[PDB]
Amino acid sequence: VLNEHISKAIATIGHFDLLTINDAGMPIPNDHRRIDLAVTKNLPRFIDVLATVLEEMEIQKIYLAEEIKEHNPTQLQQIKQLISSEIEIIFIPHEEMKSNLAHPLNKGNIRTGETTPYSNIALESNVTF
Amino acid sequence: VLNEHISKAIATIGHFDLLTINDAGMPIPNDHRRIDLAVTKNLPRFIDVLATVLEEMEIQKIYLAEEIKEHNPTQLQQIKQLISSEIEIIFIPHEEMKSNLAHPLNKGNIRTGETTPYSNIALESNVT
């Protein structure tokens, strides 16, 4: 990660803390947590930002929208190929994924240029140090 | 442009105002002008951000480092193919490109993930 805001968020991240990565259409609140990386349609791609962020975090659990199973199987598969078998995948309603953007332990909401549906994820941090 | 900060900057832009796009290594001051889009090495690319921004701005002139001609002939060529022939290309020393990051009429410094040398540009706005 060369992103400053992201490195800053990851530096304030400890056990139970959340970090999200979202597609272009996700209604992300306009606060300090907001990290807009979007350039244009599909730039950068959700999966590329995800792969990059995983390299700099110890994750415990991830959250995905139940709707991803049916509406974006390809993205679900790409996510599974990325994370290790050790990490637990929890599905919740997309509506909940939206609420979590304002979770008290949410340390950042990254916006990508992704346009495929339900390309959103929440990363829950394990013990840092 | 779907980028919120870029959109904001381009909203406050008028004649003579500047907007810059830089590679990952350019020392961009830590102020309100700074817009960090860098994800990782070469993501996003300089050329892709430039192409996007050009679609949203009326530009009069661009500034490039004189050093680009010899150290990155490829990037110079890509830039030329992107802008019209009615836009003037002014070459200045890289050192000055750096000083322009704090120009009084500079409305935004965009940081990309570009890693190739002298991939930096300054766009001067025409009448809005």
Curated annotation (Swiss-Prot), chain B:
* Highest taxon above the source species: Bacteria
Write out the catalytic residues in the record.
H15 (proton donor)
The subunit field of the Swiss-Prot or TrEMBL record says: Homodecamer.
**What keywords appear on the UniProt entry?**
Carbohydrate metabolism, Cytoplasm, Isomerase
From the Swiss-Prot or TrEMBL record, give the protein name: D-ribose pyranase
MF-aspect GO terms: D-ribose pyranase activity; intramolecular lyase activity; intramolecular transferase activity; monosaccharide binding
Location of the protein in the cell: Cytoplasm
What does this gene product do?
Catalyzes the interconversion of beta-pyran and beta-furan forms of D-ribose.
The record ties this protein, via InterPro entries, to: D-ribose_pyranase, RbsD-like_sf, RbsD_FucU
Similarity comment: family membership = Belongs to the RbsD / FucU family. RbsD subfamily.
Pathway involvement? Carbohydrate metabolism; D-ribose degradation; D-ribose 5-phosphate from beta-D-ribopyranose: step 1/2
- Per the record, GO CC terms? cytosol
